[PDB]
Amino acid sequence: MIINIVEILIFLVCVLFSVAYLTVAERKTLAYMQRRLGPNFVGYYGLLQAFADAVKLLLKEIVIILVISPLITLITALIGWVVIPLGPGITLGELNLGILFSLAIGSLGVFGSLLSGWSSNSKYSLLGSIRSTAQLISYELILTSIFIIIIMFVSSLNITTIIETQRVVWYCIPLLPLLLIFFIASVAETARPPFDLTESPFVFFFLAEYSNIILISAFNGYLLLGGYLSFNYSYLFNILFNDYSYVSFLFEGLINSSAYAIKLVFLMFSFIWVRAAFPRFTYDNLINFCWIILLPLLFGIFLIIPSTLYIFDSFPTL
């Protein structure tokens, strides 16, 4: 009732804020990469940039379908925020099949790229929308296949089960090549420019772009890196607190969300950092990179993992 509407209020309002401060963070850090001031400031007054240009963006011209694809792109980008946990067992909705949901919504996210090319059509513009679609699905493959080879060690579709399994060691440090290829497949889902031929109502694509940026950052953070995990912290508490109290649960939820947010913030900074340094791809190079060279390595990593679980006892129990 009131108990949960205040809860979803706090979460929606925090995620809606953080996606808007990313649009400022990208301008600032790319300014200082190239030795410019960029935007004047970043504070509480700092939203009034991203607010002000988000207002003025609704003042240009456009030239029933045109209504629907920005809408479904933004709501597909926004519903995937429940299923990330922010701390142990803290989800906005708890479901045992969270990866199946996360995966189905990475599948739903492709439709706005199709239906955007129909509006104000030309022959060549329609072909360009086809190319953006096909690269989006092509890297969605390797996205899904590595989700499998992560949950081979878990053998559970629950997400807090993954992170509590991850307590002994993160999955990023055995499977470090997997981190590398996920980071590039993660800037492949999105149109980040090493991977951006096919770019080089608009407010919804603009918002949902950065929402997908920070949401695939979340999808990295829980399954490859430690989700909310930083260290053990069993010993520090026995000196600070005497007993469980609302101050103690506050302090632990605080440090867990800090450990999650530092993963998400470093990864998010690395997206903007890989934006600046590199030129973009020919589309033939993009498809060739996805299929001919990276995905045979993906079948190879897929065969070498269960065999390694086979050589020892080491099958994971549900």
């Binding site: 629907i68 045992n96 439709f111 239906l115 072909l127």
Partner: protein
Amino acid sequence: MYLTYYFIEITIFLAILCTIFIISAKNPMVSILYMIALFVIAAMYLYLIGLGIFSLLYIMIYIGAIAVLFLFIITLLDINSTELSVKSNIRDLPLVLISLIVLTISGLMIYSNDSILINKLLEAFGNDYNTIITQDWFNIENTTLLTTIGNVLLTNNAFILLVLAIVLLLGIIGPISITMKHK
């Protein structure tokens, strides 16, 4: 609280409506857009019945791949299409009004085992009786549905997964058998 009762019959009515909007549409893309609406009404029904896992598999592959496939085809191809005019499609009406009756009633006949041919039909509708759900404490680990599918595809029906490999093999060979023009 009994607002929350008719939820199945609602989605049945919505599926009727949604297929009426499949077969009566102007553009060829409007029909597939109501088709992905039909897949998601179906996935709501599949969650509703007690199968949470399937609904998300239907989202993954049916508004997943094959949707994108059909949207894609309708983009990069031109297809002439006429409208649902009365002068070209009212001639089909007295056959449709027979075949609706006959195919629906006969599709509701075979769930019964009597031999009267009127007691066969009247067992399809004469079911307003509430099944009683007991708790048995015999199950110890959360073998949900997907675990049992992975146990039956892999041990009891390993050959069906292994013939299935040949079918997906053929789905890779076929489009390269056709659409390449080697040399």
